[PDB]
Amino acid sequence: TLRAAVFDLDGVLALPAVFGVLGRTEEALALPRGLLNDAFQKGGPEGATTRLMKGEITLSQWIPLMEENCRKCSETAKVCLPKNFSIKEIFDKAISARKINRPMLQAALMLRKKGFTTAILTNTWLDDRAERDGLAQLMCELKMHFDFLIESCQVGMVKPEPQIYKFLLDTLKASPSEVVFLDDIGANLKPARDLGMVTILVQDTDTALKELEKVTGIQLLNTPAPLPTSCNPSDMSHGYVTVKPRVRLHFVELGSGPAVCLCHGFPESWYSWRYQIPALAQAGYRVLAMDMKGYGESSAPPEIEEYCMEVLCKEMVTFLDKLGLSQAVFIGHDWGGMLVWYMALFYPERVRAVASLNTPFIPANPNMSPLESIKANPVFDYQLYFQEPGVAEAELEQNLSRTFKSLFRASDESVLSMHKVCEAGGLFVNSPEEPSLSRMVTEEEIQFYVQQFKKSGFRGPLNWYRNMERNWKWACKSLGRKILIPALMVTAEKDFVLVPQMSQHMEDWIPHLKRGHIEDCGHWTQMDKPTEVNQILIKWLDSDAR
Amino acid sequence: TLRAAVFDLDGVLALPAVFGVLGRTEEALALPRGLLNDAFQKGGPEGATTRLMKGEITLSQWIPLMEENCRKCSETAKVCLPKNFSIKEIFDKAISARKINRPMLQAALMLRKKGFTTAILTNTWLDDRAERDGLAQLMCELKMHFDFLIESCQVGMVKPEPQIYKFLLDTLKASPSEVVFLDDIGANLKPARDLGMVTILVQDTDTALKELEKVTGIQLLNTPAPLPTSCNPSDMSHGYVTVKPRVRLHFVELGSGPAVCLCHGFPESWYSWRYQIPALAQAGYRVLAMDMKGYGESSAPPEIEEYCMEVLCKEMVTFLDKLGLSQAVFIGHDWGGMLVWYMALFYPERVRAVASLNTPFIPANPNMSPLESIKANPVFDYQLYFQEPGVAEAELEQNLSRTFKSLFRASDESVLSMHKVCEAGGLFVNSPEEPSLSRMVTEEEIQFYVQQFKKSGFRGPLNWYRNMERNWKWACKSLGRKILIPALMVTAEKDFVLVPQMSQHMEDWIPHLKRGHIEDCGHWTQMDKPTEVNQILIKWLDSDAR
């Protein structure tokens, strides 16, 4: 019964194989067949390339040794190397072209999900070229999906020496019979086979995957498109900034590049962006996912007026000042989306670009209080229930597990009616005490939210709804303005509270507004349609905020 | 007795005054005198510009209103505006040219140091231009040096309306008689004077500063060059990353741009980089100043082998992986400098550039143990005293205040002999029990270190010295390599432990090595010569790591 799978990097997880570029270079330059491959292997175990793979010398020290090897090989073949011959140019282009073999990585992720331990065993070098960042980025993307990464140049051993396979089995804590080994080079399989390992010679990916399926008993080919990579909270960098004496904000950070601030809604957490954080960082952005004021590890003062938009926006500006960021792209959802439109209206100099998921920009009505406007819409009755301090808190804190299981559901799985909440006496008065787990979340994901809300409670979160008149008064100062910076509005078809029709007149205030629309998507946009959200945000960021 | 000073931004703290660019534009374009200034003030309190300064409209909404004003003014003057006339091009260039008036900012910093409360009171706009980041960066640099920043467009009031001066006095909690008010516009002084404030009309900076000196009694002009801006620990963003089950690393973060990791020495803290962190962030870098393993808020496991270079470097790579950084510039001092040379030797792909303060790169000697090498130099006798677990800890933890006051001294203030430490029985056996405070540090700065070392103790820090044989064995694997990435070595003339002569053969291993040398500088380089360190690092970063 197999329990571990070992993959090679070159020719298996990354294509095209850098070793195969020498074959295509000889053809293009009309050089004798196998000339560059001979210079590459020249010397065997004592040759320059073996020393490179063992970590004795770096890639830049090896380039002039391979150049000499090319000249010595050409003199024996009775041929001359071209005028523009450069080993550095050949290897720079070969390393740059190599992309991740997606079906192979997907098969490794599936095996790991099914309980297998996965590893990369590769003959690689210490890259000190001016272009070494390209290799570093590739290694980082692959690294997070594997339990172990054993690089020849770090252990001082190379394939096919039998000692590297013994070191591998020692690291894996497994017998050779429980290990599948995938390599594109025949010579590298012989030692794994001599020990008794199941070996797969990888020539083309699909045949290698059919062999892997047959030997593991798991379907790898023709399987559905997987969900985006999620966050493990304990693997994140956690940041803490004091913006005022009693107020500290917690955030999670990943990536480098332009700052992108993610602002969650009610009653959520930074964890609601778990599918976006790795994708946006991989796209080349530095992601800061906040615990908004009143939530998780951020401060939760009890005073209502501590959660009016004016105070909230001012603290967000101070957050940027203390981090030393002159600007950030602001992306919000639900209450966070309401906040990012007001950041664009009051502090445009600090906002690189503004994006809102579900929440439309609706300008304040000076002739009508927001309270009277809430009576006009029966779906907004739950907001009147949230007004009296203590009432909605007691119901929502009564059983946290029930609260989050009833709220976090796909549009067709809904168990709550947002109408006559006040008349019914509560939000959950007509709901089951033990709701079923939605297909959108796992029990482990639900438990993260109950842990976060055990410390804080719902007072801070509910206070965001208890400043309607103060927010209205403050918003009325911006009625003469327009939003003229890059802006994106994303509507969710099945959000029956923040319906797409509420955003139809936004172009009057934000004339160059860009749009996104997600079909069959409810209120919890990020966890309902994570792949679609990532695609719409990355496309917009790369064009409007870069 | 004056206790508050209020400064205007345009024409006072930032020059040239954006209002004065209209005068130079009329001259250059041969337009009638005062034509552009008339279009600018057209309408008075009800005109486009007053609405812009009140925050009613944004800068981009105001540009077409000023354009129309320019055309209406030209028709009355019987003149025609040029073919290439653009208000946007004029204002873009005017805002871009405006730099900080250094002598004025220095005078404000001096007044604040002498107990004054300082504020900026300015008529400004909501900038939504594609170039608004330039204004945002300027505002951020000025912001941190003032107690209050009151912007017209945020309060809905403008100078010279008397209500803005009443709002100012309310914010300052001071009587008009205790306030100095500096403005370049005569009209803006009249209301401050009517209330009884001391006013200074700023035409040229030096005369305004002579008036400010005469009225405050403090010398502002001809005063020495001030020290760089330092960090207040409670104003920093604190980050925490778990790199392995028992190991968490703390770091402080500021700025945006390429990642720069600062690694302190023994027995220090992230706080040792207090003068570099704001300067490097202002230069356009994202600074991560670590508490190295064993120090401050980072984990301090008791095991000796938890502090060997191999383990330390591996955890630093994991630190980059968890933050989502493919590369960082590594800058070290003392033990941190020793670590950054080994990061360059073993992980070149993760290191953008490497810099060391005081610590030279000395390659391992395979024919001689590091223990025998330490006997050959009498100044390295203190390292043999640090070997036995428990001995140096008891002396260093006995009185923390004495430990840091005896260690942190300028080269001429030394109170310790590094020779015959073992024979004498200790490091402080011939030292005063109550040493005087060095001119290099304040009592408050010393107390930060005693607070940090109260939690940790000296076991983790001293364990960095207790892996000589293991580090030697590991370093011997890199003897065939060279450092071929951008590298900087900075020597300190008066460091009598890490003398500049110890770095003389570094070019054999790092052929393209750049150098820096600081005269009259002891061991504590960062706090001894902060301005010189900042200048050498920023110059090198901008050319080699950008």
UniProtKB/Swiss-Prot annotation, chains A, B:
It comes from the Eukaryota. It catalyses: an epoxide + H2O = an ethanediol; (9S,10S)-10-hydroxy-9-(phosphooxy)octadecanoate + H2O = (9S,10S)-9,10-dihydroxyoctadecanoate + phosphate; 12-phosphooxy-(9Z)-octadecenoate + H2O = 12-hydroxy-(9Z)-octadecenoate + phosphate; 12-phosphooxy-(9E)-octadecenoate + H2O = 12-hydroxy-(9E)-octadecenoate + phosphate. The active site is at D334, Y465, H523. A lipid is attached at C521 (S-(15-deoxy-Delta12,14-prostaglandin J2-9-yl)cysteine). Signal peptide: none annotated. One of its GO terms (biological process) is regulation of cell growth. Disulfide bonds: none annotated. Its EC number is 3.3.2.10, 3.1.3.76. Residues 258-530 form the AB hydrolase-1 domain. Residues 1-223 are annotated as: Phosphatase. Phosphate binds at T122, N123. Substrate binds at Y382. Induction: By compounds that cause peroxisome proliferation such as clofibrate, tiadenol and fenofibrate. Coiled coil: none annotated. Its cofactor is Mg(2+). Residues 234-546 are annotated as: Epoxide hydrolase. PANTHER family: EPOXIDE HYDROLASE. Belongs to the AB hydrolase superfamily. Epoxide hydrolase family. NCBIfam families: HAD-1A3-hyp, HAD-SF-IA-v3. This is Bifunctional epoxide hydrolase 2. It comes from Homo sapiens. The gene is EPHX2.
